[PDB]
């Protein structure tokens, strides 16, 4: 097998083959091709705008209790207790009935975030640990240093020393959170055009140490959470749902694999018998050239999909697509995370809260947003679009961010603003389309950054439906 210019084969002490590029000193376990070379070269996108990333930090300028309960305080200092399990509040301590106009129940992201910060603070160890990393070898050096430490050492103060040279911690987290995506390591890939929809790469097995690296990456993301630092890696919301052990759904599927979702949706909503569709309860996978067949259930490759059983086929295909080829990697990541921040500490956050905790949130440029929003079967003077922008103006940045996550599937905004907004198939501006009737709820297609907004009859109805849709799940 011939190799692109600059590259050479090498064999290590255990007779395992790897590859080295004598011009750029990169090494990889997967045989490079010109496709992978051009992929790597574009990925080398200064990996600068760290100062604009740092605005997230200034922006964040704001006996045990039974599970799911919180202590909160009213604006006048009055203690109350929130039961997330029943979505109610009381002034009566559930531990002992001691009582301090019942307070409206509310999700209260900021309260949950503050309790979590206290949880981390309560479990910090004293002193510091020092991480010595060469900036040009940042991934390999951070890996060696973190993995050499007992997980509890990761709960001390972090002193990062960039070889040959507080704010160094933020810079470490930002830079390394980009560095782990380096395709030469083979841990990740993208589902969409450009760098759209990150996911674990089933082919990471070509790296014999891939599970140690996924463990390290879990430890690293947990460390960002514990130390209150923000990362820029761009995990999907279904990935975070997996970290929360939440059920992954067909709607989740739309976010990460348009074609797969579209096929499943067509099978659900069409008579597959009247149109001759011939399908069975097994699926093929190809990793590193090798094809593998997987029965969805016992003997699945022999079971014809019919009108009678196709719902079961659909659920099994959804589950399979979410977990295919990445079970071990995902476990390694979860394990590494859990030994720094117990996953149980996340139990009452949703996936969008988790993403904002990891990524930090910015203030949204309402003018840039509105200047770069496009419409389908609406115009800027439709009553519902005027109501939309009135609702966006009338609310706070938390709701705006939650709406942003609803429509685009993420809280991360592009460096160039809403004109540079990206979808799975390339550039794709925020879009509001007229669908359905005023009795529907809004819906979103995050691959196209598109909000289906029913044509409501009054501002207040638009407000209620919109708030309900962005709060949901």
Residue numbers in the entry: 381 to 427, 432 to 446, 496 to 533, 539 to 603, 609 to 916
Question: Which lines from the publication concern this structure?
Answer:
The Nedd4 family E3s have nine members in humans (WWP1/2, Nedd4/4 L, Smurf1/2, NEDL1/2, and Itch), which share a common N-terminal domain architecture comprised of a C2 domain and 2–4 WW domains that are responsible for subcellular localization and substrate recognition, respectively. Each HECT-type E3 contains a characteristic HECT domain at its C terminus, which catalyzes the transfer of ubiquitin from E2 to itself and then to the specific substrate. The HECT domain adopts a bilobal structure, in which the E2-binding N-lobe is connected by a flexible hinge loop to the catalytic C-lobe. To prevent excessive ubiquitination of targets and self-destruction by autoubiquitination, HECT-type E3s normally adopt an inactive state characterized by intra- or inter-molecular interaction.
